[PDB]
Each structure stands twice: as C-alpha cells, then as structure tokens.
C-alpha cells in the first residue's frame, strides 16, 4: 500500500534494445551510493563486428538519471583457425538475465553460439560474464567436450540465474540433453581463480550439477527459471528450479540439495499447458524462519459457472513447515490473457509490518495491455490473496505491449529511508521505472467519554452567554504516532470530531459542544513522532427536553483523522502514508438514560 507510484524515477535506453528486459540492483560494499542494473539484450554494442550483441548498463540515481554500459566484453569474435571463427556473439542476447550480489555482477548471454573443436557447427551453448573487484572473467560451464543435442551443446547456459548466500552461482541451462535441462552450480572463487582466456573448456573442482536421464524426461526444460532458499534446515541454501514441460506439460518445480544435489521436493501443476514453473521464487512470507515457495503458472485457465475457460494465470503458494511438509494454497489472477504470475519478485518487508511482501506481474493486463503489477502483503498466515496496491504501465505500445512487470526486483533500499524499494522493467518501450517506498505511520488514536452515562436530569454546568444549566459530559481524544524508518519528527495531523452524527440527515443531533452550540469541531495538531499522545478535551451537552425526536438513543462519538500531506515530506518530497491496515475512523458510544 505504501509504494510511491506518483513520483517514480524513469530510465530509458536505445530504441529496439529491449532496455529494461531484466532488472536488478548494484550495491557495492563501500560505495555509499547505489546503482541500478538494467539489461538491454538487443543493444548495438561498439564491439568490432557484433550486431545486437546486447549490453548491461549501470544507472545512477542521485543527482541526474543516466545509464552507461559495463565493459564485460570489449572485443569481437575470436578466431579458432585462420578465417574460421570460434564463436558467434551476434544476437547473443547479453543482458537477458542479470543478477548481482553486492559487488558481484553476473550477466548472461543465453543465445551465444560456438563451433566446438571437433567440427564446424553453431551450437547455442550460452555464456556468462562475472565481474568482481577489478577483474572480469568468462564463465561457460556448458562449453565443453560434451557436445551436440545429447550433450550440453544446446544448453543455453545462463538462461536463468541466481546467487547462493554461500557465494555460488546457480545457472539454469534448459536445453541440456535434448532439452531435459540441467542445473549447474559453482563457486565464485573457482570461477574467477581458474580462468584462462586461451581455454575454451574449463573444469572446476567444486562444481555441482544435475544429470541426464531417460528420454521420458526430454523436452522438459529443467532450469528454465531458478531461485534459492533453505528447504531442509541445513543452513545451506538449496536450489529451486522450474521445469515447465515436465510431467506431460503439467509443469514441475524441483528442489535440489544445495550441497550434494540430492532431490528434496517435487511440486507438480494440475492443469496441462498452464506452464507451471515458468517463474519461481522463494522467501519467508509468514515470519516462520522457513523459506516459502512461490510458483507461477501464467497460462492457467480458470473455469467459470458454465465451465468456460478463461486464461488468467495462476500462482501457487506453499509454506514450509518444520516437519518438512508444505502447506499449499492458490492465488488466481484478475484479468484475461494478462498472464498473471509471469514474474514473482519478493519485495522484502516493503511496508515494514514484520512480514515480507511480494510483487506479482501480469504484463499484458490493464488498458491497452500496458501491463499490471500487483502488490500482495504478507502476514502470519501466509501471503494475503487480496492485493493492497496496483501499479500500471505509463506508456503506449509502439510495436508490442510495454509488458510492464515482465521482470522485477525488489527488497533494496535506494533512497535510504528504511523502506525497501522496487525496480520494474517495461522493455516493450525500452524503459525501466524505479518506485520508492513511502514511510509508514501507525497511529494510536484514543477516544473516551467522561461520563459515558448521561441523562436529562443531571444538569451539572452552565452555558456561555446565558447561564442555562445543562447535562454535561466531556469528550476526550488523543494521538500518538510513529514509523520504523526515516520520518519527519513533526507530523501534521488533521482531526475532526463529530457528535451524534450517526443518523438520517435532517434529524436533530442531541449532543453539542457548549462553546459553539455545534455537533462538530476540527483541530490542527502537531505531533512529535515517538513522543507523548497529544490530547484535547471538549465539553458536550445534551439538548433539553424541548428540542428532540426522542429521549433515549445511543450517542455516537466519532473521530476521524488524516495527514496534512503538504508539510509532511522528506527532503526529496516523499510523503509518509498512514498504515492502511489500521482505521482512521473510530468511534465510541455514550448512552442516554
């Protein structure tokens, strides 16, 4: 609910490059400034002879908004033999998938081809560039002597990547072994240390990988999408992998042991061709200290009352329990052909409520299929199926839908306010848009009546002007508020108190404030956050036995409050929001005797 979608930072790249195809954040251990990583897989590079090679750009944030390419590769195609190219970087889609762990940037080119030593051919093996410190190396775990379709020749390594907290890289290569797919994971230290630019095939010692199986598993694409998290309680992040065509294209998600690759879990979709496993993610969404599993199935068709199938998209959600079992629920999308669940991007605890939150894309939904991103808050019982905030693309299609939400990354605080932010790509228009999270104010609003017992006989005080005696009671209220991140010390609140307003307009209101003979009052309050409740007291009285519709009714005492939103802003103009899971409309009853 607290994401600022009114003043996002907009970035753009070269036309036709699909700038914004893949997004992540770059956060060096000691730069004191953060950058965004935005891919552009079809970008025209300055490399000698490479067309639409693809690039990854480092984008700034403070001051201006400009992006510059990272020189992972500043050369052309190497030769194998005189007038016989070793490799083909043309249309390699470099920047198609980008991930970063603080300083370490892993950027892949899934469509890279090479000839292999044995004979001339063009195998889509796939390569990645890993940058750390001041050195960059080429990593290509499938570029080996195990070639052709029954080997790793068609691997497309780097198609989907992630990082393991153990400083390992997890690469999904869905084309291995006749598209059975293979996961390969290795150590950063091994990749960087065992590097030689004159060697095409490099062996590593601490490498883990899946293995080829029977033909019945062909065309499953294992390693289509990957994610990590601890699913067995060993302290070692395990490997989560989507396999969209598994089990007769029901789609499956596999979890492999992050230490020895033994299989741990098998999640199977229910509907054929829903493409279950398209996108997978893991996070603790309920505060149980166990990673939970989030699986998209973007083509899922939901049957209506007459059995009619509506293609909407589905996300399967399951919580991990200590016993080793999972508790499964389901979340459906909202719009037809929007492909809800195409991207799952954990936001971390974006609203700072103690639970992690998740953004789920539906890239072809909304007016003109601009694309929609739905934000679902977490809670102790699992992900809340009801979205609290909806984001939409702000650009028209030029040749294809902007596909806003196609790829997203959250849980990184860029504006340094304690509330993690979110980057959303919209590659169809060559753009990327950064949303920042607003501070959240929780308000303790008190309301009391002294005495709550009131009548027409107990006249206790006199009115101003003419000293008529009336039955008097006091109405008190007070406010305290605070947040968890960076908020202005002085909060500006507007409060209005109404007496006996809960009735048909035109009816007589029985309770009035004696200073003005009015059933309503408002005040301008300045409240220091984290301080004392600021209280006020007004004296109310009942109309006498001459001005009424009845004598015995409940009296509603109603308090409404809101933020000013004019002075309520930080140095960048970012305004706080009241917690949307709490009321700002409260009441008490007093009773007439």
């Amino acid at each position: 609910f607290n994401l600022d979608v009114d003043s996002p930072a907009e970035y753009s790249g070269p036309e036709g490059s699909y700038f914004g195809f893949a997004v992540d954040f770059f956060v060096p251990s000691a730069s004191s400034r953060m950058f965004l990583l935005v891919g552009a897989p079809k970008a025209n590079t300055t490399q000698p002879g490479i067309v639409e090679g693809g690039q990854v750009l480092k984008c700034d944030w403070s001051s201006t908004r400009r992006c510059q390419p990272i020189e992972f590769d500043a050369t052309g195609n190497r030769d194998y033999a005189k007038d016989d190219p070793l490799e083909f970087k043309s249309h390699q889609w470099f920047g198609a998938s980008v991930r970063s762990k603080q300083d370490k940037i892993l950027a892949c080119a899934p469509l890279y081809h090479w000839r292999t030593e044995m004979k001339q051919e063009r195998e889509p093996v796939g390569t990645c560039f890993l940058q750390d410190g001041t050195k960059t190396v080429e990593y290509a775990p499938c570029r080996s002597q195990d070639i052709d379709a029954d080997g790793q020749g068609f691997c497309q390594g780097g198609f989907s990547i992630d990082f393991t907290k153990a400083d390992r890289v997890l690469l999904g290569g869905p084309g291995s072994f006749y598209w059975q797919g293979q996961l390969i994971s290795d150590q950063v230290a091994e990749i960087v240390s065992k590097y030689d630019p004159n060697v095409y095939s490099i062996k590593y010692n601490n490498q883990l990988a899946t293995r080829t199986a029977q033909a019945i598993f062909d065309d499953s694409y294992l390693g289509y999408s990957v994610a990590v998290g601890d699913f067995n309680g060993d302290g070692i992040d395990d490997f989560v992998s989507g396999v969209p065509r598994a089990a007769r294209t029901l789609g499956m998600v596999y979890i492999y042991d992050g230490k020895n690759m033994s299989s741990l879990y098998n999640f199977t979709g229910e509907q054929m061709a829903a493409y279950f496993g398209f996108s997978v993610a893991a996070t603790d969404i309920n505060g149980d200290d166990y990673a939970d599993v989030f699986i998209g199935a973007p083509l899922f068709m939901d049957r209506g009352s007459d059995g009619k199938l509506q293609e909407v998209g589905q996300v399967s959600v399951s919580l991990q329990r200590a016993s080793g079992d999972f508790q499964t629920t389901k979340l459906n999308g909202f719009e037809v052909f929007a492909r809800f669940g195409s991207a799952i991007a954990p936001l971390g605890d974006l609203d700072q409520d103690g639970f992690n939150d998740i953004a789920i894309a539906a890239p072809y939904g909304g007016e003109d299929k601009k694309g929609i991103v739905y934000i679902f808050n977490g809670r102790s019982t699992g992900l809340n199926a009801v979205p609290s905030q909806i984001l939409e693309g702000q650009w028209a299609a030029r040749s294809m839908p902007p596909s806003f939400g196609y790829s997203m990354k959250g849980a990184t605080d860029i504006d340094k306010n304690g509330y993690p932010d979110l980057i959303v790509g919209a590659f169809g228009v060559d753009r990327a848009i950064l949303y920042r999270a607003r501070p959240v104010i929780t308000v303790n609003a008190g309301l009391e009546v002294y005495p709550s017992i009131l009548n027409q006989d107990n006249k206790t005080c006199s009115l101003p002007g003419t000293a008529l005696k009336v039955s008097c009671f006091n109405v008190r209220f007070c406010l305290k508020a605070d947040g968890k991140g960076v908020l202005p010390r002085k909060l500006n609140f507007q409060v209005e108190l109404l007496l006996d307003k809960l009735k048909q307009k035109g009816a007589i209101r029985r309770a009035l404030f004696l200073y003005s003979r009015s059933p309503s009052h408002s005040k301008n309050m300045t409240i220091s956050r984290g301080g004392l409740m600021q209280c006020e007291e007004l004296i109310a009285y009942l109309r006498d036995e001459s001005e009424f519709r009845d004598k015995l009714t409940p009296i509603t005492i109603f308090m409404e409050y809101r933020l000013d939103y004019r002075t309520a802003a930080d140095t960048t103009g970012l305004q706080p929001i009241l917690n949307q899971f709490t009321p700002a409309n409260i009441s008490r009853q007093a009773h007439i005797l």
Partner: protein
C-alpha cells in the same frame, strides 16, 4: 420485464430464434427456449494440416491414398465435400533449427533424400472440389526437419483457422481442420528459448501463402487457440500416431469442440479416423455464450431428447437427424450499466440477444 421473440422472416435453419430482445429491471429475470436442430447432408470443408518434419515421412506417403477413397466414404455423410492442404514444421530460429550455413542448405544429415527448407506454416492447396488436386498436392510434398522434437502445431493451426480468405473456408459449410502429427506441440511460452518474447496477436499473417511472422511472434496459448477456433466455427480433429496421442487426448477438455483419435502404426486408418470423427462431432451439441454485457449474467441448461439435463457447455450427446435439442436460457440482472451471442460450438449459425435495461 418481458421477452420479445421476432416474428420476422428468420434467416437460420439450425438455430432459432436467431434474434431475441429482452427488457430487464434490477432484480428481474427472464427466459426463453433456444432451439438447435442439426442438419443432415452438410456441405463439408476438410483441410489437411500436416506435420512434415522428418519423423512423419512414413505417414505422409499414405496420404496419396486419401483423396478418392475419403471422397467416396463422405458421400453418405455430406452433400458437398471439398479437400484442402497445407503443412507446417516449426519456428525457423535457433535453437529449433540449425543455423550453420552448410547444414541449413540440406536441412538434414541424410544425403540420400533431399529435405526441403524448414518453415513455419505454408498453405499449399486452397479448399477445392477437385480431388485430383488434393492427391497431387500430397504427391509432390517433400519432407523437412528440425532439431527439437516438439512442433509448431498450434501456431500453424491458428493461421489456418484465421486466414479465411486464403484457405477458402465456406460460410455455408461444416468447417473441419484436421491436424496430422505424432509429436506434441510447443506452448506459448516455449519461445522464450529462441529469444521470442513478442505475444501472438491472433491475426492473419500470410503473404504468398507463407506465414511470415513465425520468427518474430511466439506460439499461441491454448486459450487463444480455442477462442479463434470457436470464433471461426472450426471443428478441430487431431490425428496422432504416437504415444503422444494421449497428450493431445487429455487436452480435449481444454479445447471445446475438439475431437482426437489415434493413427495406427501402419497408418491404415487415415480415412476411417476422419469419417468416424465427423460422425461423432455431428452428434455432439453444446453451446456457449459470449457475454460482454456488464451487470447481466446468463445460466443455460441443455434439455436432452432422452430426458437428461446437462448444464452450461456440457450439452447433449447422441443427437441424430429429426432430433431437436432445447436450450433453456435464463438471464438475470444484478445491476444497471449492448448484446450477447449464444452459439453452438462448431456451427455456422448463431443467436444474438439484445439486452435493454430500463433504469
């Protein structure tokens, strides 16, 4: 609140009334019976969409016996039977095909047989009364190939269904789209592997009988595929030789109006499959409603000749000649805020209902 049934000359033979106009008020309901009465001896348009990747070589050669024999068998089920023909392989992009200059030239490793260049979808023969042309279109058909086993079946089907002016589908006909294969098909999201992230817009993209957006647009989803097949009144018949048949069979519940059968290992039943599939399709009557009217909901139940009742799109079974199926249509209004179309799936005639609201 009322229902008006026009007494004007009707322009439908199977579906009547083909036009209904009703008046609703919030909280109101109204209903009527819609009659569906299938004809015997239909004009029939049968288009052969054939998988021509290398594994199909030994089945394709058997299509040379289909023209005249099938025409004779259909003489007892139809009045006017036409044949058409086209073929498909896959998307002509890496990694689905080789892109090496020397391999693409031959498109296979077999130097005995000449393989044709790979293609997405090509239209070969427009639907025609001429049986000889069908047999000739088949006789000169060469075999192609690819690297990946799955095929671009659904992509070719959409173009075959949508490009009406090129295929030559008649409005005055039962439109049959026969898909011949042995392997499973690619799904909409499989194309990411080839670098194709552009959605299929569901339009017609043929030039000189060649589908030219096959390398830039992804495969259609099943949702899109069924939508277009129903909208264009096409009854799909799948003919699958391999164990993959079961893959197709179990997708039938997701593709209303579709039927599938098996091709024998000898491919000796190519004509029997078509005739039997036709006979089963003609006896299955079900309807769906396209409801774009906001605040209005429909509840339709099929009332069968045998006394059973089957709700929604379930419809009635074992329908014959001189046999009416009645559909009980109730419209209920929840709120104030156009028309909706109620049609039998696989039929050329539809009923349009106009829903007025006095608010």
């Amino acid at each position: 609140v009322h229902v008006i049934i026009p007494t004007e000359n009707e322009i439908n033979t199977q579906v009547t009334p083909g036009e209904v106009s009703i008046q609703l008020r919030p909280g109101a309901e109204a209903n009527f019976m819609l009659k569906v009465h299938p004809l015997k001896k239909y004009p029939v348009d049968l288009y052969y969409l054939v998988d021509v990747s290398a594994s199909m070589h030994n089945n394709i050669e058997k299509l040379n016996s289909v023209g005249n024999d099938l025409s004779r068998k259909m003489a007892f089920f139809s009045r006017d039977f036409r044949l058409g023909f086209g073929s498909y392989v896959d998307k002509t992009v890496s990694p689905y095909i080789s892109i090496h200059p020397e391999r693409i030239h031959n498109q296979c490793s077999d130097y005995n047989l000449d393989c044709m260049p790979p293609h997405g979808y090509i239209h070969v023969l427009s639907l025609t009364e001429n049986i000889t042309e069908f047999e000739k279109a088949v006789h000169r058909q060469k075999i192609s190939g690819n690297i990946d086993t799955p095929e671009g079946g659904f992509d070719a089907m959409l173009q075959a269904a949508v490009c009406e002016s090129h295929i030559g589908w008649r409005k005055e006909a039962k439109r049959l789209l026969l898909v011949m294969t042995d392997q499973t098909s690619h799904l909409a999201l499989d194309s990411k592997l080839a670098g194709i992230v552009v959605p299929n817009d569901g339009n017609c993209h043929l030039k000189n009988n060649v589908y030219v957006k096959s390398t830039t647009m992804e495969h259609p989803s099943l949702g899109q595929l069924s939508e277009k097949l129903i909208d264009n009144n096409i009854n799909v018949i799948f003919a699958v030789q391999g164990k993959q048949f079961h893959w197709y069979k179990d997708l039938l519940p997701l593709l209303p109006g579709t039927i599938a059968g098996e091709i024998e290992s000898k491919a000796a039943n190519l004509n029997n499959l078509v005739v039997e599939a036709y006979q089963k399709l003609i006896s299955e009557v079900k309807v769906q409603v396209e409801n774009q009217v906001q605040g209005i909901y429909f509840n339709i139940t099929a009332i069968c000749p045998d006394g059973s009742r089957k709700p929604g799109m379930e419809g009635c079974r074992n329908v014959t000649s001189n046999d009416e199926v009645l559909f009980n249509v109730t419209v209920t209004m929840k709120k104030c805020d156009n028309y909706a179309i109620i049609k039998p799936i696989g039929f050329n005639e539809t009923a349009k209902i106009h829903i007025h609201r006095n608010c």
